[PDB]
Amino acid sequence: EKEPDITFFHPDILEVPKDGGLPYLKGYRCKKCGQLDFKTEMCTNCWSEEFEMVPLSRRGKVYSFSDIYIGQQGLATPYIFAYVDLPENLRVFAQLEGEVDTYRCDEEVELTLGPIRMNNDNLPIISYKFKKIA
Amino acid sequence: KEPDITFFHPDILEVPKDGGLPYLKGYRCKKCGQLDFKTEMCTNCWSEEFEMVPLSRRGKVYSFSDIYIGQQGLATPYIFAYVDLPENLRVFAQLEGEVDTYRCDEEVELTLGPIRMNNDNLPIISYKFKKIA
Amino acid sequence: MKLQREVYIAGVGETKFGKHTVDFDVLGREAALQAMNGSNIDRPDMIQSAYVGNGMNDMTTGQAVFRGLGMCGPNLPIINVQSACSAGAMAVFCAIKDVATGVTDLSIGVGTENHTMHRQSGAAFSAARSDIETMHGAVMTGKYAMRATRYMHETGATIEDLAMITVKNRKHATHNPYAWFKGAITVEEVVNSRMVAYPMTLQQCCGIADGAAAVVVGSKEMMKKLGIAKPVKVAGVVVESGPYHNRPRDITGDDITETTSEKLYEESGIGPKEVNILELHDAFTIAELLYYECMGLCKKGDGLKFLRDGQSTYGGQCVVSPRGGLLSYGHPIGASGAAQIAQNVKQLRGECGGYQVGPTPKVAMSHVTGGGLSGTEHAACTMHMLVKGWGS
Amino acid sequence: MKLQREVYIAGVGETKFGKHTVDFDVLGREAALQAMNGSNIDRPDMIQSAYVGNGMNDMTTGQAVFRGLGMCGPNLPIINVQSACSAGAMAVFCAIKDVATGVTDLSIGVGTENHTMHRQSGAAFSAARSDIETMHGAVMTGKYAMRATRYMHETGATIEDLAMITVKNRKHATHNPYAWFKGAITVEEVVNSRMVAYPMTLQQCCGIADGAAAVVVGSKEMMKKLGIAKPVKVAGVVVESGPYHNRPRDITGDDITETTSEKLYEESGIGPKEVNILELHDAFTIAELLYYECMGLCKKGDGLKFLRDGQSTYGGQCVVSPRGGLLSYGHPIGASGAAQIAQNVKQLRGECGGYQVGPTPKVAMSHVTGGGLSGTEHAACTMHMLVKGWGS
Numbered sequence A: 001e002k003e004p005d006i007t008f009f010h011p012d013i014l015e016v017p018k019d020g021g022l023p024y025l026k027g028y029r030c031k032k033c034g035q036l037d038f039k040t041e042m043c044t045n046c047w048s049e050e051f052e053m054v055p056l057s058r059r060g061k062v063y064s065f066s067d068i069y070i071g072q073q074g075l076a077t078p079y080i081f082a083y084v085d086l087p088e089n090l091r092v093f094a095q096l097e098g099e100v101d102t103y104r105c106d107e108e109v110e111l112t113l114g115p116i117r118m119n120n121d122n123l124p125i126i127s128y129k130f131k132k133i134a
Numbered sequence B: 001k002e003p004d005i006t007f008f009h010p011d012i013l014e015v016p017k018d019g020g021l022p023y024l025k026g027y028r029c030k031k032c033g034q035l036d037f038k039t040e041m042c043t044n045c046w047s048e049e050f051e052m053v054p055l056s057r058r059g060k061v062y063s064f065s066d067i068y069i070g071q072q073g074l075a076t077p078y079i080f081a082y083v084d085l086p087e088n089l090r091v092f093a094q095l096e097g098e099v100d101t102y103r104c105d106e107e108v109e110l111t112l113g114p115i116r117m118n119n120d121n122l123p124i125i126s127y128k129f130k131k132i133a
Numbered sequence C, D: 001m002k003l004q005r006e007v008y009i010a011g012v013g014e015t016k017f018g019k020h021t022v023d024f025d026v027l028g029r030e031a032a033l034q035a036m037n038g039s040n041i042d043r044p045d046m047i048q049s050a051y052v053g054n055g056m057n058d059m060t061t062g063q064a065v066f067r068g069l070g071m072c073g074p075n076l077p078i079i080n081v082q083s084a085c086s087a088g089a090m091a092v093f094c095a096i097k098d099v100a101t102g103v104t105d106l107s108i109g110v111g112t113e114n115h116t117m118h119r120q121s122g123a124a125f126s127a128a129r130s131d132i133e134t135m136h137g138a139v140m141t142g143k144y145a146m147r148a149t150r151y152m153h154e155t156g157a158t159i160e161d162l163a164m165i166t167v168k169n170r171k172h173a174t175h176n177p178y179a180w181f182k183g184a185i186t187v188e189e190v191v192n193s194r195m196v197a198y199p200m201t202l203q204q205c206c207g208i209a210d211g212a213a214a215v216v217v218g219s220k221e222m223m224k225k226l227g228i229a230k231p232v233k234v235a236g237v238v239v240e241s242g243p244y245h246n247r248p249r250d251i252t253g254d255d256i257t258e259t260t261s262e263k264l265y266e267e268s269g270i271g272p273k274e275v276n277i278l279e280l281h282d283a284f285t286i287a288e289l290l291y292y293e294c295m296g297l298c299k300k301g302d303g304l305k306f307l308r309d310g311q312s313t314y315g316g317q318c319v320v321s322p323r324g325g326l327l328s329y330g331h332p333i334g335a336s337g338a339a340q341i342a343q344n345v346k347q348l349r350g351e352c353g354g355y356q357v358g359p360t361p362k363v364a365m366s367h368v369t370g371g372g373l374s375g376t377e378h379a380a381c382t383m384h385m386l387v388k389g390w391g392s
């Protein structure tokens, strides 16, 4: 299609400030019941549609991960993905930057941006990932 | 890498290796006498014992349709029909010929020809029916 | 199936039908939420079981539908159902059965499908993937077209007669915003549209559409508990499988539609001449015309007279396809069986505005089949009989 | 689901599992015929309803199964069901519900699938890019691998411990003709097989297979009328959907397996320590290990000790995967949930010859899940509790 496929994921989860400020993940807190979640049309706990935007911590912690040697079609292998827990008590699934056989559970990691896959036009989709701090 | 079929199907279409005229095959249940196409068990009485019955090469177009929008991947137009045999069996099959030429109750005769391309892009030869002289 | 206690429809939901870019789960969620809102259900923890019909999208359609509503969990058993085009009606049937048996007091049936985001145009649906007729090139257009060719042969009916079905169904849909195609079309425009499977031209074929619909059902006490003002009573509902054989059946009849409709009349105690509106499986023009006789709306041989005399449109014995039928909505396989019911409910309730049947119908019947299986006219059939359930 | 009256299993059916060149309908029919013959049914239309589970063969699989038995028609309502790997168990569940509620006195559930005869892209076994974890590259083996890594982190389990699940399950299957892979395999062979997503190697993952099974269920009176010698009582059966949220979970637990099994124990009145054999969703070695804890066979954190102590093989508290599990049969999506039940019935009846558990089991439990979009552990879970129903 000459109307392009996406090159970014996703404006309601990963905030890239237009003035060049550091990107951050964001959640949305239900104003009725207080549930924090990623962006959704209605609160899955109480069905309210009234929210407040909550910027999320850029530091998280690898809860678990796996080195992927046989993965999705079209992604370069090996790659790594993980459950990354944020201190706001939200869990984010994301790729980890780096080499196989180097991550451990409960390791601290920091948000970063990079290509997570190629789109239908064979151009990279840029999204959030996490990387080692030191 | 093992190859795709080029013939459909030995359980319903017999091609005599002696070069005799091909024919469709029915099967008669030995226990209840019901005639049907090949099955593992009789739909009427569940018996597994049958005798093979060569079927008439001549049939009648019960109904048909000229197909201009086909299955994905099939060249168009083509024609298919319910062809009724004297043995009181109905066969679904393509008809050889041109659109806008068939009629209900038209007599037709068995013939072999390609029904589709296989996954190696070779023709699958099967049973069709054609107009008689 | 005999209902062991009364079962009533509270809220219903329906998306617009046509080419959608959102997928089956979003459509299904929209219809389900509409049905819940219409039932005064304002919390995720009220419905007690859910059934979701689908054809080809997904093996966990209902869990995908309800995920974003926060309703999946230990108190919501979800089961997904399939019987090609019967699936949306079977979902409502399963929900009815849970209530009628006392397994639940409040359940929901959803039908949903998105076809257009998952296939290329320019081709018709085949028969079943594993079916012998599919090997030989069977497409559903031609399978129904053969019934029209034979009907024309036996009765002298012309393609212009069959075209009147599209004219009427599109007329019915004129003011219905949910339909895909609608409004005034002439016999000449129907007959001169491009041939698809002779003698079915484009405008005599149902569209390959996306959409969803949902139906909440509950007990008499649950209707009162929820403050439902116009509960619609399920007077009967019947599921059959189609007889299989390789003998020369009369394809201008329809074994399973005949027997399913008779059983529905017997169990409900309501005869065909008492039905005020009917949504049936008008996948092709010929299907509706044949079903006038198969369902006993008129005597043998009178189907075309029934049509020509106006008996299936406004002012006649039975308004058939008042929402516009499959010939106006198009036909998302998993959705149509539920969508017929949602619109029948709205008609019973007087809620259809510019396409509302007058006098208000009191008895509404629906019918979907499901096919592609060689040796059967249809693999399955599901029919519902619904009636006014609020007194005056 | 509480059972309104007792329900018993009469005959069961089971094909060989592996690569079949006959399709899902032939396999399903073979299993259905066996189950009906094993129920001493002389009049097939005594079977009053049929449910058939399938994942991706077709939309009318149950009608395609029964048509070759001459059983389709007005006296056999057939509904097909889907919840990815839950489908075959849900088919049996639907049949049990029909009997328990008195809708029927005799019903049948079939699960069937043929994968290997069909070109299935790989995208059919996965969710769409729309699913957030899939957008970021998730694959099922890596999702379960993360569960294994977390378990190794918490317990000190090694890859060799995980591989012992494959070793055990193939050992159990040694003399089982229905299983596909069977007999002795060494830990080093399992560990040294190709790495898919650390620590899951190829031999720790179940494979795709073709197969079918069937279960006839009926009332107590129907068991007496059919002369069934060893009717197996349905002590309980539970269907759940998986909760959705984005909070940190303990993935060495399993929210829906925990709640489904607890509800099964509560409804049946049978606790986990009373279960003598268990078939469960061993799609990967780590799943069986975690489910020891999730089902309450042992305490949190003790699954590794349970395994090493031999408590999940012959002589132990509960023989887990005595037929060999998915790790020996492979996994035809629509079949496995029905097949677990068929083999558990055979074990309860003492019929499994060289793979028969001794002493004879009296309590048998079965478990399949299925699906799992982002934010869920699984889309569905179906569990059955079965007990000896004959006296002395």
Ligand SMILES: CC(C)(COP(=O)(O)OP(=O)(O)OC[C@H]1O[C@@H](n2cnc3c(N)ncnc32)[C@@H](O)[C@@H]1OP(=O)(O)O)[C@@H](O)C(=O)NCCC(=O)NCCS
Pocket (backbone or CB within 6 Å): B069, C019, C085, C121, C122, C123, C124, C125, C140, C141, C181, C196, C202, C203, C205, C206, C207, C208, C283, C331, C371
């Ligand atoms: C008749 C049929 C083959 C036409 O499909 P098609 O040729 O591929 O047509 P396209 O999808 O490419 O659409 C072409 C245009 O015609 C219209 N159109 C498509 N189908 C139409 C239909 N059935 N009726 C009227 N108009 C239709 C437009 O929507 C479309 O224009 P658009 O680009 O703005 O959307 C298809 O509708 C069909 O197969 N219908 C029967 C489906 C069926 O068998 N269902 C199961 C019944 S049991």
Ligand SMILES: [Cl-]
Pocket (backbone or CB within 6 Å): C085, C369, C370, C371, C372, C377, C378
């Ligand atoms: Cl159909």
Ligand SMILES: [Mg+2]
Pocket (backbone or CB within 6 Å): D042, D043, D044, D045, D046
């Ligand atoms: Mg009988």
Ligand SMILES: [Zn+2]
Pocket (backbone or CB within 6 Å): A030, A031, A032, A033, A034, A035, A043, A044, A045, A046, A047, A048
């Ligand atoms: Zn809230």
Ligand SMILES: [Zn+2]
Pocket (backbone or CB within 6 Å): B029, B030, B031, B032, B033, B034, B042, B043, B044, B045, B046, B047
């Ligand atoms: Zn016979």
